[PDB]
Design a protein around this ligand. Sequence first.
Ligand code: NI
Ligand code: NI
Lengths: 59, 59, 59, 54
Amino acid sequence: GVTTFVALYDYESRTETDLSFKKGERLQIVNNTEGDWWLAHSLSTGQTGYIPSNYVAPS
Amino acid sequence: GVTTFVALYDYESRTETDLSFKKGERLQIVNNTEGDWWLAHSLSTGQTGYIPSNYVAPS
Amino acid sequence: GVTTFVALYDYESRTETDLSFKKGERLQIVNNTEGDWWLAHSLSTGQTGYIPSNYVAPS
Amino acid sequence: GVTTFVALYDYESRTETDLSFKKGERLQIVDWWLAHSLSTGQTGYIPSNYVAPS
Ligand code: NI
Ligand code: NI
């Protein structure tokens, strides 16, 4: 199936480009080569934005 | 590092491998930016494709 | 939903790490930061491997 | 370009926080390295001393 990560914690947006999400939300990672901020697409909300990589774990 | 640009104009692309986008859409720029066309991920839609560098500026 | 690419042409695996796919196949791109070869996970077959970057377009 | 390593040993991540893998599994590398498994398509960190160039 689609490979995803799962949110370990809620995250509230603080910037124009980050992605808010709730604990347990399934996220498809689009780009994870730029250090601690990964570009993610939420499979719940359809939104796309940067996430703190330490808030997620492989599904 | 995470590099985000913003579209200055609407663009309706001419091939499926180039993104169409709207003015104000934010785009993560990936890879080598030495040409006129840059690989990008849309923060509006999550799609990936090439964009014309003259249509974007740092966000 | 899941953000995907579609194969533009058939491709037959020739190495231990590339991925076979057929024209029209829906693929997840896991990495596309390294240039001419991207890492894909097929949503049609479940297989994973490198693909030529110019063989796919956003769905 | 794409950098592929191969696992020299099995590794079972106690919690599913790092990548679990088997000996012989190939991994794209993008003490701990972020990797994509070419067997499962999963992504996670792996211990660099468990891998060698494929
Ligand atoms: Ni799968
Ligand atoms: Ni979506």
